[PDB]
Design a protein around this ligand. Structure first.
Ligand code: 7TS
Ligand code: 7TS
Lengths: 326, 328
């Protein structure tokens, strides 16, 4: 973690107030603070990048701001205004700027904005007191384990929110994966236990065919998986590069069948931390199957090169995704 | 409000659960990266301590809570707190804060809140290697109306609904607001997959009474894997059998509830749980539909069971099943 953190308080009637930059250090809670009992909390994640001209920039921070608000609404948490969200990013970079790594490769500074209920009380109801903190931390094909025993979120629930509870529910599967020598978990839909949703901390894309004829398929926003900002961006970039894209349902049977037939030629996972991570093989119960030759796919690495290029300030930001933080 | 003291126990991978100690009730500290603040790795319980006429403090089925906290812990990848350490923590707090247990023998008792949360600093999504357990205490039949949630779902099969886990409660807060907006006091939740089978209330299990007198049948949702196996629920099923009522655990459709209530087949409805013991349900809102349960008054079977269970917990009715045990 870096040297400082940004703290902001909420009190009913007063709104979000008392924003201040303080050292990174322990915080205090009443034993009956609602977050310790009923998990009323939401969070975000995004990076600060250093550019060649010496500036520090963010990638689609406005999207994170709005998503923290969408998550907060689902959890009955008062929304942090986008302007205050953005300003907290600027405040932290101003004091901890030396922590942002050099330009220009994979290295960046990870920013963790988060909100938790602090009001003391064992009644099960939305809190009237909260805290927001902003902290910072300095920041290869994988195998995936299909979870059949566990479900992470369901329609009408909290899966489209970045809510701590979704991650808690995933811990046992994430241990069961490692016990099968897999790197990550792919989650299936709650209702029919068939349709691909997402991985534990990433969205998932499928490449079908190859060359100019190659096209992208990704699970549609079901209501129970996260609308990732990397996912959103890659949809836009694929369209920019002339790839057909389909947001639709795809189940594990279609995945296995089309991979075996060689129609699915690449699979990749995407998210803020790794940008894009190739998926080489899949374990589904007793069976295992490989994606193509198990190596990083052509479209996979082309999209990754485009997106990291924009983020590092090497390639034109045609969508106006980058903004200055310091 | 809270009593004077709390019990604190730490978990670390070399020591396991250790350093159990009675300390004043007061603020606790967490690293900003403590896993509970990001990924909600936490579970909890709730039970009461009762003062009896003879001066003793007793627990009701505290062994059941000890085991359920372990079951909850297991589902949330939390190292289990041994049952003996759980029971001892109840005894430790009652020993110093006994004077806080209210007088015998009405509705008043001392509510106990055992709870575990992840304290290890780290932003990696993995089970914590460090936890804290706290035990805190807090001093503790009007019919209610219920709103059937059709828009929100509280837990998923394959999920965490059979565990007493903070995240189930977090997920439920938005629906509880829609209920108030429609005049109702509590929320009834339906199953995730088919959006039609009755699960439970936000903090209580639900029962239906069919018919009347000795031939009445007590009906309750079967354990689905996504609703909480309430200890009050478990006890009332036994008490119903003791009394000679037929009991049925099964899947019950929401469209069956209103239909049988309107036909006079469902004669009573109630909710049960640690805090209120039994709360009669008078009225139900489901979408546009609204229906009443009989005359809206507490039902005969409802109050017979409530009187028996409260009687056992206050020591005035014979404890045939050995549910009551000395705390201090
Ligand atoms: C469940 C889940 N799905 C998808 C994603 C990808 O979302 P994106 O990053 O906005 O593209 C994340 C990562 N979300 C996080 C982003 O930064 N830290 C995170 O935990 C996630 O936790
Ligand atoms: C979702 C849910 N279902 C059912 C119940 C009833 O469970 P029982 O009390 O064991 O009969 C509770 C209350 N659980 C609590 C028991 O004490 N404090 C509580 O929050 C609950 O929170």
């Amino acid at each position: 973690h870096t040297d400082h953190m940004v703290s902001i308080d909420y009190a009913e009637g007063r709104g979000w107030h008392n924003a201040r930059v303080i050292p990174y250090g322990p915080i205090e809670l009443d034993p009956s603070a609602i977050v310790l009992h009923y998990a009323q909390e939401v969070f975000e994640g995004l990076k600060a990048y250093r550019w060649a001209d010496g500036s520090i920039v963010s990638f689609r921070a406005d999207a994170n701001a709005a998503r923290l608000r969408s998550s907060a609404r689902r959890l009955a948490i008062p929304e942090l205004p986008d302007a205050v969200f953005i300003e907290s990013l600027r405040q932290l970079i101003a004091v901890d700027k030396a922590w942002v790594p050099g330009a220009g490769g994979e290295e960046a500074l990870y920013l963790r904005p988060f909100i938790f209920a602090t009001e003391p009380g064992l009644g099960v109801r939305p809190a009237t007191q909260y805290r927001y903190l902003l902290i910072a931390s300095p920041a290869a094909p994988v195998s995936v384990w299909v979870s059949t025993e566990y479900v992470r979120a369901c329609p009408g629930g909290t899966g489209a929110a970045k809510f701590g509870g979704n991650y808690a529910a995933s811990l046992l599967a994430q241990a069961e994966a490692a016990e099968n020598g897999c790197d990550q978990v792919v989650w299936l839909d709650a209702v029919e236990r068939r349709y691909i949703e997402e991985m534990g901390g990433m969205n998932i894309f499928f490449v079908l065919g190859s060359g100019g004829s190659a096209r992208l398929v990704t699970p549609e926003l079901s209501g129970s998986l996260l609308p990732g900002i990397t996912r959103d961006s890659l949809l836009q970039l694929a369209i920019d590069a002339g790839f057909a894209v389909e947001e639709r349902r795809i189940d594990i049977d279609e995945w296995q069948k089309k991979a075996a037939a060689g129609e699915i030629t690449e699979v990749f996972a995407c998210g803020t931390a790794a940008v894009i991570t190739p998926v080489a093989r899949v374990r589904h119960g007793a069976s295992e199957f490989r994606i193509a030759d198990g190596q990083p796919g052509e479209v996979t690495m082309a999209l990754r090169d485009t997106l990291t290029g924009i983020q590092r300030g090497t390639f034109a930001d045609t969508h106006g995704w980058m903004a200055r933080l310091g």
